[PDB]
Amino acid sequence: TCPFYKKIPGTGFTVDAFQYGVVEGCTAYFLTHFHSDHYAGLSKHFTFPVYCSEITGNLLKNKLHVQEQYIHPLPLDTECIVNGVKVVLLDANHCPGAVMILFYLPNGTVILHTGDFRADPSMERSLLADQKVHMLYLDTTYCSPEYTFPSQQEVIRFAINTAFEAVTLNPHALVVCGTYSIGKEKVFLAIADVLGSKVGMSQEKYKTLQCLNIPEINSLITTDMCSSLVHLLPMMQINFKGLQSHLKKCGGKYNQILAFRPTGWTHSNKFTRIADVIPQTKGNISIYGIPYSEHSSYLEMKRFVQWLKPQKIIPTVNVGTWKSRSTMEKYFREWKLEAGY
Numbered sequence: 001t002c003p004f005y006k007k008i009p010g011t012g013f014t015v016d017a018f019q020y021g022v023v024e025g026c027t028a029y030f031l032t033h034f035h036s037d038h039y040a041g042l043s044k045h046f047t048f049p050v051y052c053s054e055i056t057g058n059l060l061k062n063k064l065h066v067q068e069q070y071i072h073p074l075p076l077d078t079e080c081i082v083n084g085v086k087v088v089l090l091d092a093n094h095c096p097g098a099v100m101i102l103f104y105l106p107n108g109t110v111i112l113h114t115g116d117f118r119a120d121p122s123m124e125r126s127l128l129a130d131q132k133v134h135m136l137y138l139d140t141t142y143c144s145p146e147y148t149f150p151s152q153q154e155v156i157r158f159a160i161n162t163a164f165e166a167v168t169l170n171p172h173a174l175v176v177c178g179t180y181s182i183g184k185e186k187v188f189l190a191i192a193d194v195l196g197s198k199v200g201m202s203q204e205k206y207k208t209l210q211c212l213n214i215p216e217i218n219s220l221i222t223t224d225m226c227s228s229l230v231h232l233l234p235m236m237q238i239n240f241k242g243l244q245s246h247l248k249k250c251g252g253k254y255n256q257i258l259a260f261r262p263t264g265w266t267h268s269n270k271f272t273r274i275a276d277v278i279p280q281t282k283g284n285i286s287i288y289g290i291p292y293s294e295h296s297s298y299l300e301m302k303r304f305v306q307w308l309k310p311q312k313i314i315p316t317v318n319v320g321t322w323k324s325r326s327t328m329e330k331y332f333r334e335w336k337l338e339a340g341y
C-alpha cells in the first residue's frame with residue numbers, strides 16, 4: 001500500500017507511486033526521473049495522467065511504450081496549472097530529465113519534493129529563493145557525515161587524464177565503461193572526447209541515449225563497435241571474466257583493457273583522495289572504481305537545508321529501519337539549532 005511520504009496532502013497528487021495499483025483518490029501521478037525504483041509499475045497498460053519532464057516523457061513513450069495521450073510533459077522553471085494547483089519543475093542535478101517539484105497548495109502551504117538530487121549552491125538562485133517552503137520531502141541517500149566524495153569536475157579530470165595517458169602509451173589499449181541506468185553520461189563522453197573517438201554501445205543503449213536531448217549527440221555515439229575505441233557495457237560485465245570475454249570478441253584489434261566502474265560511495269573515501277586511487281589488475285586488464293555521485297554529499301545536503309529553512313522535513317530514502325530514521329532526525333535537529341530556524 002502507498003506509503004505516506006509519496007502522498008501530497010491537500011491534493012489528489014502522488015510522486016513516484018506506480019507500484020501500488022490504483023491509489024485511492026489520486027487524480028495525477030508525478031514521476032521525478034526515469035530510474036527503475038521510481039517508475040516501478042508503469043507500462044503500456046497505464047491509463048491515468050503522468051506529469052514529468054520532456055526527457056522523462058521521451059523515455060516513457062519510447063522505452064516503456066506508455067501511450068502518448070497519458071504523458072504530460074512540462075517545461076522547467078515555469079509556473080503551470082495542473083488540476084487547479086500551481087506547480088513548478090526544477091532541475092534536480094541528478095540524471096537527465098530528473099526534476100524537483102514545487103507544489104503551491106490552495107491553503108497557502110508550499111511544498112518541495114526533491115526526488116533524487118545532488119544539491120548545489122546554484123539552486124539557491126532558482127525560483128526557490130522567491131518564497132518560503134513549509135514541507136521538504138528530501139532525498140536522504142547520504143545523510144550521514146562519513147559520506148564525503150569529490151566534485152563531479154574532479155572525478156572527470158581524473159578519468160580523462162588516466163585514459164589519455166594509458167592510450168598514448170599503448171594505442172592498442174581499449175577503454176570500457178559500465179552502465180545500468182541513465183545518468184553519469186559525462187564519464188564516457190568526456191573520455192571519448194579526449195581520445196577523438198565516438199562511444200560504441202548496443203542498440204538498446206543507443207536508443208536510450210537518443211531520448212535525452214543531448215546537443216550534437218549524433219556526433220558523439222554509435223552502434224558500430226569496431227570504429228570506436230571507448231565501449232559501453234552492462235555494469236554486470238565489468239569484471240575480469242566479462243572483459244576477457246569482450247576482448248576475445250574484438251578480433252585481435254586490442255591487447256589491453258582499461259575500465260571504469262562508476263560506483264556511488266565506497267568506504268575507501270574515508271581514507272584516500274581522488275588523486276591517490278588505484279585499480280584492480282589481472283594481466284592486461286585494469287578496473288578503476290570512481291566515485292561519481294548524482295546524490296548530495298552530507299555537507300551539500302546540510303548546506304541546502306540550512307539555506308532553505310523548512311518547517312518540517314520528511315525523508316524519502318533510508319526510511320525502513322528505526323535506527324536510520326532516528327539518526328536522520330538527530331542531524332535535522334543539529335542543523336536547525338546551528339542555523340536558528
Ligand code: NI
Binds near residue numbers: 033035116
Ligand atoms: Ni535516481
